[PDB]
A paper describes a structure:
Echovirus 3 (E3), a serotype of HEV-B, first isolated in 1953, leads to highly contagious and severe diseases in humans, such as aseptic meningitis, myocarditis, and anicteric hepatitis. In line with many other HEV-Bs, E3 utilizes CD55 for viral attachment and FcRn for viral uncoating, gaining efficient entry into the host cells. Following rounds of purifications and analyses, three types of particles were identified, one containing significant amounts of viral RNA characterized as mature virus (or full particle, F-particle) and the other two being empty inside with substantially different sizes defined as expanded and compact empty particles (EE- and EC-particles). A number of key structural elements, including the VP1 BC, DE loops and C-terminus, the VP2 EF loop and VP3 EF, GH loops, contribute to the serotype-specific antigenic sites and construct the “canyon”, where many HEV receptors often bind.
By contrast, the EE-particle exhibits a typical expanded form with a ~ 4.5% increase in diameter (~ 340 Å) and notable perforations at the icosahedral two-fold axes. Of these, the one named 5G3, exhibited tight binding to E3 with a KD of 0.25 nM as determined by surface plasmon resonance (SPR) and potent neutralizing activity against E3 (a 50% neutralizing concentration (Neut50) value of ~ 0.3 nM). To decipher the bona fide epitopes on E3 targeted by 5G3, we determined the cryo-EM structures of 5G3 in complex with E3 F- and EE-particles at 3.9 Å and 4.1 Å, respectively. The overall structures of two immune complexes reveal the identical epitope and binding pattern. 5G3 binds to the viral surface along the edges of the pentameric building blocks of the virus adjacent to two-fold axes in a similar position to that observed for R10 antibody bound to hepatitis A virus. The 5G3 epitope contains residues 283–287 and 292 in VP1 C-terminus as well as residues 140 and 143 in VP3. Disordered in the apo structure, VP1 C-terminus (residues 275–292) in the complex structure, however, inserts into a highly hydrophobic cleft constructed by LCDR1, LCDR3, and HCDR2. Notably, none of the residues comprising the epitopes are conserved (0/7) across HEV-Bs, suggesting that 5G3 is a serotype-specific neutralizing antibody. Therefore, 5G3 could potently neutralize E3 infection via blocking the interactions with its two receptors.
Numbering used by the authors:
A (entry chain 1): 99 to 244
B (entry chain 1): 56 to 146
C (entry chain 2), D (entry chain 2): 81 to 330
E (entry chain 3), F (entry chain 3): 61 to 238
G (entry chain F): 4 to 82, 82A, 82B, 82C, 83 to 112
H (entry chain L), I (entry chain L): 1 to 115
The structure:
Amino acid sequence: QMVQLRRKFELFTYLRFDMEITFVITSTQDPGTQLAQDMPVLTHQIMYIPPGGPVPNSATDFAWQSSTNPSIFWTEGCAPARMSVPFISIGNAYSNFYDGWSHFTQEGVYGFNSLNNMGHIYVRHVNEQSLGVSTSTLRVYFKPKH
Amino acid sequence: YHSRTESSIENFLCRAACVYIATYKSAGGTPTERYASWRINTRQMVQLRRKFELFTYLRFDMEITFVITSTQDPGTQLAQDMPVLTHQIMY
Amino acid sequence: RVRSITLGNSTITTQECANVVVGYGVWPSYLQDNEATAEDQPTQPDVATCRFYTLDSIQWQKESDGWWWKFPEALKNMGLFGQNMEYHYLGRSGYTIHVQCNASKFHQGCLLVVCVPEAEMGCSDVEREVVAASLSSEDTAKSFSRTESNGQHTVQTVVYNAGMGVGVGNLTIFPHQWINLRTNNSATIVMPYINSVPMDNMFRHYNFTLMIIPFAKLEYTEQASNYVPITVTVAPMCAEYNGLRLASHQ
Amino acid sequence: RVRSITLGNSTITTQECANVVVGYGVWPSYLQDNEATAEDQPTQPDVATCRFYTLDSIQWQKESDGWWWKFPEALKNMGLFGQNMEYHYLGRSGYTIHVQCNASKFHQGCLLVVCVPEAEMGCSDVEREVVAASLSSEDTAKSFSRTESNGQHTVQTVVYNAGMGVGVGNLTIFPHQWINLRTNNSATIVMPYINSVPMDNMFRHYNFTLMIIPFAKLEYTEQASNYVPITVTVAPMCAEYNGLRLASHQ
Amino acid sequence: NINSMEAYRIPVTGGDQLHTQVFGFQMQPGLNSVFKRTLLGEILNYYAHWSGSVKLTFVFCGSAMATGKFLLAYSPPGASPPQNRKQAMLGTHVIWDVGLQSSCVLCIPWISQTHYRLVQQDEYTSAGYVTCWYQTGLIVPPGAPPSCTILCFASACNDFSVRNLRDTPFIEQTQLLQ
Amino acid sequence: NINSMEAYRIPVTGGDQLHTQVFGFQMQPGLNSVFKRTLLGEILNYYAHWSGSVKLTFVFCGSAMATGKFLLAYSPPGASPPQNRKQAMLGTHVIWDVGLQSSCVLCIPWISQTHYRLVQQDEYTSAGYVTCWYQTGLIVPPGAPPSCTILCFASACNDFSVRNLRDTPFIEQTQLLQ
Amino acid sequence: LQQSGAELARPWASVKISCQAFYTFNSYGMQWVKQRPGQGLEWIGTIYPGNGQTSYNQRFKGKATLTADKSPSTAYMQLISLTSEDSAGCFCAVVPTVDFDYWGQGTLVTVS
Amino acid sequence: DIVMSQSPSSLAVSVWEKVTMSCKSSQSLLYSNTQKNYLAWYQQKPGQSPKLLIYWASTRESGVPDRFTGSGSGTDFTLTISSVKAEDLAVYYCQQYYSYPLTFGAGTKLELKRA
Amino acid sequence: DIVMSQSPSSLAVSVWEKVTMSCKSSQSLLYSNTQKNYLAWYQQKPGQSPKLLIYWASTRESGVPDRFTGSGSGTDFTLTISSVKAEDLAVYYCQQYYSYPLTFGAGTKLELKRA
């Protein structure tokens, strides 16, 4: 999705790396009536759904409480949240290019259902905040290692 | 030849799991919602119950962790300057 | 100096002593023990598949732009190697593409013979996708074009972008050879098996693409035969399979 | 005592420890130097053709007379050995016919399993000749008859003259085995290659005929399954060829 | 039969068939309706990746006076199921003569392009089929019952491994008990 | 020619010129329109500093019956481009006789006051020029084509280095794809 | 013996014709003939199931595709890039290397 | 064997009346590689050789109107005839590309009803 | 390619008149293994599918009279029609079994001549 990093990765056919993802979450108080007033502290859950893992349809779903999907509970006001994901593939490398098809009959899409799946990342507020709305903005700083 | 450490008994039965979510207030009314209570049993949560019920006899220590997030209730006579909340968790 | 090469009890190719390009620096080899994931033994058909499959000759005319073959579909009907693509499930093979031209000393021109691993190609219409019938024919070449292609499900076959959206002069990054008719006559590239898995199904996946692009166009006077035949000869190396069954596909 | 036999990476046959008949006293072997007349080398396909070709089972009923298969036409469609009969000119092969029955202890009967070299057969009409469609089917048996056949171009399929004009009790002269259901269950004959030339074309020539004739007929009471399946399993031995070409015939 | 014991017994009727099929299934443990509830396929549903061999064992639960032959064919992952007994013979088969042996152990090889394999992901015609065909029938003396029963037993092998633990698809309850 | 293959072929026409120029460019890799899109000048645009030599190779793509001579001059960084063949002769030149050799490898020295050199910064008349002049012409027998073609190939050398990584000037897209 | 029912096609497109044989597909291939009312009979090709071979006349190479499966036991022929010159009656016949024997009926291809 | 049902087997209808006809398969003629139903629709004019109507069960042919349109998926299909004209009185046969015995359907005989 | 000539291309004849028709091959359709000419004779009734007349260029079929008889060898043949009747007015095509492009002949159109 990001062209600047896509061009650097597409100088190579086959890649193999761990991930080092960092989340910069800054929240704010929404305007309007029924204000936040005394808001105690915001806690956020960041869930990494491993490839082929339960994916949340929306907020307050069981996918969030699934033990299988690794999660980070982070409280605002301190250092950002960090996680590291190893090389997760049935294959022996990721492939930037795939001259081929997804089904054995040369049917489907020209190189999109390949085993180059790294998973998803889902973030929500843990709090049950009734009065006032708090709008947070997530920044994902992805970095490959090794 | 692969590795079998992912399916050892420690790696299969040692994951943290949210087993109890309750709420408790901080002002009067009925003397029940001012505190929380949980008898430690591995039978109320079906997902963890099925993993423990692959075995007849178990022996383990516990590692309990408490994630407490508070909020300000609406209505009149607001909290305003609230200094800091301290909580007692008793085993 | 005119040494003959016999590979199997069917094939004879005559060739002088010239330069070869060996892959990314490795020779093709057989799979060892700490390289595979499959639950069985390979049972390589060494006794029958190692021979020369000389494809049909293309005519390098004055106004031609370039040709590509996708592999291993380029040997889909070629003999017993095409039968092994039918009656198996996985496959793994290196190749020794030998390309040579028959020009006089009064012809001039220059070719670039590339082997492009994972040469995924874009479509001639954006917001659309290619079909398999426009990527490659089974044994004949696919022509690049000087102008812009404009079809619905075809390939962007313009020549200076090489079908991949790159500069055509930068294809020298992959294993390559220059046939310069002044001095060189032939070109021989030894490609190993490159994949991210040890064995893949050789119907859906295209392992590499052999492109032959003329950078300096062919010129000749009026006495001369107005084409130069380019003859490609593919010999598979260290082919091994798995999954004996019937011909489920095609 | 229930030892399994695996021949090639496709075949498994289970069998106990019993008696074999080895040809006219020789095992099948490969051709040596002072035995051939052809101008080339054999290039035997040992790596692919040595396996078990279990044909379809016949039903030994109470009123059946006998069955014959002509060889090597009996493996005309059976796999790669049928392909070598197409894409070659000469051929030479021994066989290991294994015949076994599945009867209970409450069945009774007796079979004679003969391998007849050069079993040339007479026609059902004198002053006439047979056709190739009446000598043998490609994979199924041909039945002998109790009564007299009366066709125009058929075979004299009466059972006590064995199609050759001889006494049926004298077929014990050729390599044979008796399946007596009281004591024996199976029969295995190892035929070598018998010809007057070192290699013959295996479309026109029938090397031998495998006959299975019941001498004591099958009896059973009313509880019993009213047939005994006879299963024939042919494994070629030391097959070698000459004359690589296309499939000129069929 | 799923609400009875008849969903464990493979019926082998006695008489005149000699060319039909006994059973057949798609060989994918932990995903197949045939395998996902056994001990091997209940452990595989706790993980997202799996790798190894499957060992099948077929026990002929008939009388000692009964005799017959079955053709136990195995087809590779990129291959079609055999349609008759002649197609299954030219593939990979064993001949199980039930008069000689009562059990036929059939171990299944591990063939894949990659190292592990996804359990919940379904790849049609890429798993393998294990079918069984009548070869002779079932011959019984007077006094023996003509129809019989086969039972199948599946397990893992020594090269088996799993990875990427998750939650089992079988348990749907979510709220706590009471 | 930039939208065709004619922007790779240096035309050497045959006849009576004997004093004119074949080509010429400013020798600054990664900044010159001639060099900024090749493999060397695509890597140099990813960095802010660079240091090392550039190796040029000119291949005469004519017929084996053709004969001629070219004067391949190189001018230093603080020096003017040669205007005729006599000015280029007194500088640094090689004589490329295309009847004897088909390729003329021309390596270019690294001359600068400082250690590295900025890639995007432009310093006019401080890079060097590589021009080429007709010396004899192009002599062909009856039957050979009179006009011909040169191709140029640029790379780095062993003493090459870069520093201070940044973003390439070529990619202008900023918002994510879809 | 059976052939496809009459069908209406569009030029520059394909047609799939079917043929049904009661006899087993062995030792003898399936013939395909295109009849021109003005002229004579023209052979398209034969697919020989007994050895599995597939072949076409040079005129029809690149035009006709012959495909016969096993369990359905029906022979098919496909034509593509249809023009008015393809409008004709197409027959399927059998051949036991002994004779062309019979053909039967056949849907009149009508490109319009 | 895969059998192809057709209902109604025949129906007589007048001019300018939207007619349909169902062709239900005994097995879902839809595979999960490309998601393209394997079904063919055919018009056999009275005393004529049949011609193509709808291939891939979704796409039209040249020289064919929008009163011939494939519709459906899985194992049940129909061919919507929007505005009938004087060239639809014929017998129509559906067919499947999936199982090798390429059996056709029962055969709907769209009949013409006059005054 | 082996081409099959027919002469006359057509001829009109009355009732009870012995007619013939030649079919000459550009190559001798007779091989020296069995000595059996590879030639087929066919009757395509007016507006009808053709039927067999003579196979092996020598033998008759069932339901066929002696006014249809193969005759010849090598590369020249003819079909003697002894006593013509009211079922011979049709077009007849010869054919060869020898070369794989199985081309038919030009096609004689035996025409009917009335009063």
